[PDB]
Structures are given as structure tokens and as C-alpha cells.
Amino acid sequence: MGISWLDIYHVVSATVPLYVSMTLGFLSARHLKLFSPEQCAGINKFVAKFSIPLLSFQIISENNPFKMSPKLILSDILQKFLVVVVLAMVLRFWHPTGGRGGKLGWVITGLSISVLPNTLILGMPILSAIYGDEAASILEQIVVLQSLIWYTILLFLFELNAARAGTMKILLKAWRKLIINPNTYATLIGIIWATLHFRLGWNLPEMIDKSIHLLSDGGLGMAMFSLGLFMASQSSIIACGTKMAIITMLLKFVLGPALMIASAYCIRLKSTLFKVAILQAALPQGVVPFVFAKEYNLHPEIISTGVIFGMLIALPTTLAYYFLLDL
Amino acid sequence: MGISWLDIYHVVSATVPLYVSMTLGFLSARHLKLFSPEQCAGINKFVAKFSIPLLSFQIISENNPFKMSPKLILSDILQKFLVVVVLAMVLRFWHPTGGRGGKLGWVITGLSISVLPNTLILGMPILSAIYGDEAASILEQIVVLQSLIWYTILLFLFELNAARAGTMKILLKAWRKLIINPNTYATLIGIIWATLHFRLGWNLPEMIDKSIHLLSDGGLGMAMFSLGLFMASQSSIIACGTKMAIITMLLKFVLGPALMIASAYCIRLKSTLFKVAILQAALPQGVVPFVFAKEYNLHPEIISTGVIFGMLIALPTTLAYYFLLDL
Ligand SMILES: CCCCC/C=C\C/C=C\CCCCCCCC(=O)OC[C@H](COP(=O)([O-])OCC[N+](C)(C)C)OC(=O)CCCCCCC/C=C/C/C=C\CCCCC
Numbered sequence: 001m002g003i004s005w006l007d008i009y010h011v012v013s014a015t016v017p018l019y020v021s022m023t024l025g026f027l028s029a030r031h032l033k034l035f036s037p038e039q040c041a042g043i044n045k046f047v048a049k050f051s052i053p054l055l056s057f058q059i060i061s062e063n064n065p066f067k068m069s070p071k072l073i074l075s076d077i078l079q080k081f082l083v084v085v086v087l088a089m090v091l092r093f094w095h096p097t098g099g100r101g102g103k104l105g106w107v108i109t110g111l112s113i114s115v116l117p118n119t120l121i122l123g124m125p126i127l128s129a130i131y132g133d134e135a136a137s138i139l140e141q142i143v144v145l146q147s148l149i150w151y152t153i154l155l156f157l158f159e160l161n162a163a164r165a166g167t168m169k170i171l172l173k174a175w176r177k178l179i180i181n182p183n184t185y186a187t188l189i190g191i192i193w194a195t196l197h198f199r200l201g202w203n204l205p206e207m208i209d210k211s212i213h214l215l216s217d218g219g220l221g222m223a224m225f226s227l228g229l230f231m232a233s234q235s236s237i238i239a240c241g242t243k244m245a246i247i248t249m250l251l252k253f254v255l256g257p258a259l260m261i262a263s264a265y266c267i268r269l270k271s272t273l274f275k276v277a278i279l280q281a282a283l284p285q286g287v288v289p290f291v292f293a294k295e296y297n298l299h300p301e302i303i304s305t306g307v308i309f310g311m312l313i314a315l316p317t318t319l320a321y322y323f324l325l326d327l
Numbered sequence: 328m329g330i331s332w333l334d335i336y337h338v339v340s341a342t343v344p345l346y347v348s349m350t351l352g353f354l355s356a357r358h359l360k361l362f363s364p365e366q367c368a369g370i371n372k373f374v375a376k377f378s379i380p381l382l383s384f385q386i387i388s389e390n391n392p393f394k395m396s397p398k399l400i401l402s403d404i405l406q407k408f409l410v411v412v413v414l415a416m417v418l419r420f421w422h423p424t425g426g427r428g429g430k431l432g433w434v435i436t437g438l439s440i441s442v443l444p445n446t447l448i449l450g451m452p453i454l455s456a457i458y459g460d461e462a463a464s465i466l467e468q469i470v471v472l473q474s475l476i477w478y479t480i481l482l483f484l485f486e487l488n489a490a491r492a493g494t495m496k497i498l499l500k501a502w503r504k505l506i507i508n509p510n511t512y513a514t515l516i517g518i519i520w521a522t523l524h525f526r527l528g529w530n531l532p533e534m535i536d537k538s539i540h541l542l543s544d545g546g547l548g549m550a551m552f553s554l555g556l557f558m559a560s561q562s563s564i565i566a567c568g569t570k571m572a573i574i575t576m577l578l579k580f581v582l583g584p585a586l587m588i589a590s591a592y593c594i595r596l597k598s599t600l601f602k603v604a605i606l607q608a609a610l611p612q613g614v615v616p617f618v619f620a621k622e623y624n625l626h627p628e629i630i631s632t633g634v635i636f637g638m639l640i641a642l643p644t645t646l647a648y649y650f651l652l653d654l
């Protein structure tokens with residue numbers, strides 16, 4: 001496998017649908033002037049509460065939880081610990097804005113620009129096309145972590161930052177916020193049902209499965225449409241300027257993949273899992289962190305710029321990493 | 328073959344998904360109080376402008392236009408002429424409200440409560456489940472005819488009624504209103520591409536087909552969700568009143584199917600096409616007529632009540648007609 005032009009063409013053909021399903025939303029929100037800002041928020045609200053949860057359930061319910069590789073989980077833990085260590089070290093010698101501010105604020109804006117890629121909508125098709133169906137069952141293990149263990153911790157830290165800017169009270173507030181999250185319930189039920197379907201042999205009734213599919217189908221396309229609407233909402237792609245966009249992208253597409261490579265070497269992962277993990281780490285930034293930043297107002301411009309430009313540059317960077325890892 | 332409890336169970340299993348995809352929207356708009364009126368309006372706009380056109384294209388491009396049986400088209404013409412004649416006769420004898428309202432206005436109110444059922448969203452799944460895939464290729468003929476000729480004549484009639492309350496000026500205004508419709512463009516390109524595909528042998532490129540599917544997939548589910556939102560919008564199911572609701576249901580589910588039976592007998596249709604036509608005529612009322620009524624303010628209450636109550640009572644009538652025609 002020399003990465004001939006045929007493979008790159010196949011990846012491009014697999015990724016074009018989810019880019020033309022996004023340019024449509026961008027044009028509708030910006031050029032065609034089809035949706036009002038409140039109307040745009042209506043679509044953005046429906047998708048994140050009906051398609052992302054149902055899509056997450058339909059993606060996580062089709063995996064034997066007992067087959068989850070502990071090595072990949074430990075590699076994820078090690079990566080998201082090393083990134084924290086490096087962020088703490090760098091923030092001790094170079095404040096990004098100069099003027100002193102909450103260190104935890106800059107460590108929470110970090111860990112959202114570095115080690116929380118988009119692994120449901122914009123990250124599943126690309127990796128599946130690049131590495132076939134083998135890699136589609138590996139992201140299905142990292143998505144579970146990102147939805148259960150990492151986003152809950154990020155929410156708790158966001159609440160802590162909002163309060164600081166009793167610990168038990170903060171934990172209780174984070175719990176209340178989490179209980180009303182459709183995605184956490186969807187992924188929890190997905191794993192609980194996958195356990196049953198793979199151990200006891202239970203199968204979803206035709207009615208239930210088809211009802212779930214009706215809304216799950218098109219979840220990727222409409223999620224990309226909503227992401228395009230979000231891009232159209234912003235006045236300019238580079239919200240904070242060149243200085244904080246180059247650094248954002250350098251972090252996301254170097255310190256993430258590089259730290260994942262270091263973690264894999266420490267854990268000594270294997271082929272068909274090392275490359276998948278690295279590409280996952282190299283995926284564009286996720287959206288949920290942007291939602292948290294907007295809700296708690298923690299540098300929304302930086303995270304929005306990172307998300308938008310990383311999503312735009314997904315194909316170049318992802319193809320570059322795919323070519324590099326095959327040497 | 329025949330009628331038995333297992334067949335009814337299969338029909339119910341095929342229809343339940345598109346009812347639980349609608350109760351979700353109803354609850355989100357009314358009970359859960361999830362969407363503000365502007366947000367639900369935006370969702371409705373998005374679906375009607377992106378999923379209905381794309382779904383129509385993906386449904387009409389598959390069948391062969393050259394296989395369109397002229398007998399079914401002639402039967403549709405005869406039905407929608409007989410309904411006009413009967414409506415004109417009855418209106419002269421007995422005015423519905425007695426307020427000396429415009430006869431043309433009530434005729435336009437008719438021809439939509441009678442002979443314009445929902446054949447894309449709520450008509451294709453039910454009929455396909457009842458009669459397998461044979462009926463799915465017969466509805467597409469009626470679907471394309473309704474989208475092209477009948478929904479253009481109805482638009483022209485609405486414009487004429489609005490002006491009545493120059494003929495060339497009215498035709499020009501109707502043309503302007505028709506041009507901006509995306510559904511008309513989608514249903515036209517559907518045949519323009521099906522002709523090439525079935526005659527010239529051309530096939531959609533993988534990229535184009537997958538891009539179309541991304542948004543077409545789940546179009547039925549989100550269309551039912553939008554229909555549920557619309558149902559939740561209205562304060563009560565029976566808007567105009569009990570008498571008007573009863574008259575609307577009686578018309579839609581007796582005069583439509585009865586006139587279609589008369590037209591089929593006149594044209595002498597055949598088995599596997601007669602029953603499909605009758606059930607199609609017995610489907611619940613369509614939505615586009617409600618959109619026109621709301622835009623031009625032509626008895627929105629009666630049409631909305633008919634649409635909602637037909638959607639709720641779709642199965643008790645479709646199954647009844649299926650049982651009746653199998654004797
Ligand atoms: C606060 C205390 C009460 C907490 C809730 C209590 C109990 C658990 C709830 C439900 C049980 C069913 C499964 C979980 C669904 C959770 C749905 C959910 O979170 O409801 C609320 C959520 C809306 O969000 P919000 O409330 O923040 O609105 C805020 C709106 N404003 C900001 C404008 C005010 O609604 C949505 O997300 C829409 C629905 C999303 C559904 C996602 C799960 C999909 C699962 C499928 C599995 C199906 C079948 C399995 C069958 C197995 C056996 C055969």
C-alpha cells in the first residue's frame with residue numbers, strides 16, 4: 001500500500017458528500033438569506049437534541065462493549081494527561097494574552113482545542129473511508145469516552161471556572177446540567193443496550209429499530225448542515241486574528257497527534273490501531289466544547305475559529321497524516 | 328394474498344415509525360416546550376425547502392418515466408374533473424356557510440380536501456407496506472403528476488381567487504410564484520434525469536448520489552417531525568367546528584375514494600393498479616394545499632383541521648379501504 005492516487009480519490013469521494021451538505025447550509029444562511037437568526041437557532045437546537053443523540057445511540061449500540069480494547073482507552077487517558085501537563089508547563093512561562101487571567105480558563109480553552117476532535121459527524125466518514133470498516137469500530141470506542149468521561153469532566157471544570165471567576169455545590173450544579181443532556185443519556189443507553197444485544201442476544205424490534213433509523217438517517221447530513229449554518233453565523237472565519245488562529249491550528253493538528261504518538265509509543269499500540277488513534281487525534285476540533293464555551297463565555301472566538309477552520313482544512317491535514325503514517 | 332391479522336400487523340409495524348417520529352415533534356412543540364414559534368417555523372422552512380425537494384427527486388428519479396401507464400393518468404384526470412363537477416353542483420344547491428361567499432373560493436377549498444392526498448411522506452410508506460414494492464412505483468406517477476400539474480393549477484386558482492376578491496397578469500404572477508418553488512424544480516429534474524438514466528443509461532456519480540442521499544435520508548422522518556410540530560402549533564384539533572370537521576373528513580375519505588372508483592370503472596383499470604389508485608385517493612390530505620391556504624388566507628382552519636385529523640386517523644381508514652377492496 002503506497003497510497004496511490006486511487007485511495008486519495010476514494011477518500012475525497014467519501015468526504016465530498018458531507019462538504020456539499022455543509023456548503024448548502026452556509027449558502028442558505030449567508031448568501032441565499034433563507035433563515036433568520038432565530039430560525040437558524042431552531043435548526044441548530046433540533047439537530048443537537050434529536051439527531052446527535054439518536055445518531056450516537058445508533059453508532060454506539062452496534063459494538064460489543066466487551067471487545068473494547070483497554071490499550072486504546074489507556075492511550076487516550078495518557079494523551080489527555082500529557083496534554084494537560086504540557087499546557088500547565090507552557091502556561092507557566094508564556095501567558096497567551098499577556099494580561100494575567102485565570103490559568104484554569106486557559107487550560108480549559110486548551111483540552112478543547114487540542115484533544116477533543118470531532119469523532120461523530122465529520123470524523124466518522126473520513127476515517128471509515130481511509131481505513132475501511134476496521135477503523136469505524138475504533139472511533140466507536142473513543143466516541144464513548146469523549147461523550148461520557150471527557151465531556152462530563154469538561155462540564156464540571158467549566159462550572160468550576162464560572163464559579164471561581166463549595167466544591168460539593170459545584171459538583172451538584174454540574175450534575176444538574178448533565179442530567180438535562182440528551183447526548184449523555186443517548187450514549188449511556190447505547191452502551192447498556194449493546195451489552196444486552198451482544199451478551200444475551202436481544203434484538204431491537206423492527207418497529208423500534210425503524211423508528212430510530214428514521215431520525216438517525218440523515219443525522220450526519222443535517223449535522224453538517226447545522227455546522228455550515230454555524231459557520232455562516234460568524235462574521236469572519238478568523239475571529240481573534242492571525243496570532244490566535246495559527247496557534248490554534250498548530251496546537252490542534254500537531255500537539256494532539258504528536259501527544260497521541262507519544263502515548264501510543266509509551267503504551268506500545270499495534271498496527272490497525274496506532275494509525276487509527278493518530279488520525280482520530282488529528283481530526284478537526286469538536287463542537288460540544290464550542291457549545292460549552294459559548295454558554296459559559298470562555299473565549300468563544302478562539303474555539304469557534306478553531307472549529308471552523310479545522311473543519312474546512314480536515315481533508316488536507318487528514319490526508320497528510322494518512323500519507324505520513326504509511327511510511 | 329387475502330387479508331389476515333399478520334398482514335395488518337405488518338402494516339402497523341411499517342406505519343408506527345412515522346407516527347413515533349411525529350409524536351416526538353408534537354411533544355417537543357407542546358409538552359416539552361422545546362422550540363419557540365420562530366424556531367419551529369425555521370425547522371418547517373428548512374424541511375419544506377431541503378428535504379421535500381431532495382426526497383421528491385430521490386423518489387422520482389428511480390422509476391422509469393416511459394413506464395408511466397397512461398390509464399392511471401387518465402383516471403386521475405377523470406377523478407379530478409368529476410370532483411370539480413360535483414363540487415360545482417353541490418355549491419349551487421347548498422352553500423356551506425350561507426354567507427354568500429365566493430364560489431371559486433370554496434371550490435379551491437375543495438379539490439384539496441378531496442383529491443389532493445399526502446402521497447410523498449404519509450402515502451408512500453403506508454401504501455408500499457400494504458401492497459409491497461408494486462404500489463411504490465405507481466404512487467410515483469401520481470406524486471409527480473400532483474407536484475407538476477395539479478399543484479400548478481391550484482396555485483393559479485389561488486392567484487385568481489386572490490385577485491377576484493387581467494388574466495395574463497394573473498398567469499404571470501402565478502409563474503413568478505411557481506419559479507421560486509424548489510419542489511417544482513426537484514420534481515422536474517427528477518423526470519429529466521430519469522429519462523436519461525433509463526434511456527441513455529447514465530448513472531449518477533458516487534459523489535453526487537451520496538451527497539443527495541445524505542439529506543434525502545431521514546427526509547421522511549424530519550417531514551413527519553415537522554408535521555407533528557404543525558399539529559402542536561394549533562390550539563385544538565377541531566379548529567372551525569364539529570360540523571366542518573365532519574364534512575371535511577367525509578369528503579376526503581368518501582368522495583375522493585368514491586370518485587376514484589367511478590373514474591376507474593369508467594377507464595376500466597386492472598388489478599394491482601385499481602386498488603393502488605383507490606388507496607392513494609383514500610390517503611390523508613396533503614400539506615401543500617394548507618401552505619397555499621395559509622399564504623393566501625383561504626380557509627386555513629378547515630384545511631388544517633382536515634390535514635391533522637386525517638394524519639391522526641390515517642391508519643383506521645387506509646386499513647379499512649385495504650380490507651374493503653380485498654372482497
Ligand atoms: C430533570 C429531571 C428529569 C430527567 C429525565 C428523567 C428520566 C429519563 C428520561 C427519559 C427516558 C428515555 C430515554 C432518555 C431520553 C432523554 C430525553 C431528554 O433529555 O429529554 C429532554 C430533551 C430536551 O432537552 P432539555 O430538557 O434540556 O430542553 C431545554 C429546552 N429549553 C432550553 C428551551 C428550556 O429532549 C430531547 O433531547 C429529545 C429526545 C432525545 C432522545 C435521546 C435518546 C434516544 C434513545 C433511544 C433508545 C430507544 C429505544 C430503546 C428500546 C430498548 C428496549 C427494546
Ligand SMILES: CCCCC/C=C\C/C=C\CCCCCCCC(=O)OC[C@H](COP(=O)([O-])OCC[N+](C)(C)C)OC(=O)CCCCCCC/C=C/C/C=C\CCCCC
Nearest residue numbers: 033034035376377380381384506507508509512513516535
Ligand atoms: C427567480 C430567478 C432565478 C430562478 C432560479 C434559476 C435557475 C435554476 C436554479 C438552480 C439550478 C439547480 C437545480 C434547481 C435548484 C433550485 C433551488 C431553489 O429553488 O433555490 C431557492 C430555494 C429557496 O427558496 P426561496 O428562494 O423562495 O426562499 C425565500 C426565502 N425568504 C422568503 C425568507 C427570503 O432554495 C432551496 O430550496 C434550497 C435548494 C433546494 C434544491 C432542490 C433541488 C435538488 C436537485 C438535485 C439534483 C442533483 C443533481 C443532479 C446532477 C445531474 C448531472 C449529473
Ligand SMILES: O=C(O)c1ccccc1C(=O)Nc1cccc2ccccc12
Nearest residue numbers: 048118119120121146147223286287288
Ligand atoms: O463533535 C463533538 O464535539 C462530539 C464528539 C464526540 C461525541 C459527540 C460529539 C457531539 O456531540 N457533537 C455535536 C453536538 C451538538 C451539535 C453538533 C452539531 C454538529 C456536529 C456535531 C455536534
Ligand SMILES: O=C(O)c1ccccc1C(=O)Nc1cccc2ccccc12
Nearest residue numbers: 375445446447448473474550613614615
Ligand atoms: O403532502 C403534499 O401535499 C404533497 C403531495 C404530493 C407531492 C408533494 C407534496 C408536498 O410537497 N408535501 C409537503 C410540502 C411542504 C412541506 C411538507 C412537510 C411535511 C410533509 C409534506 C410536506
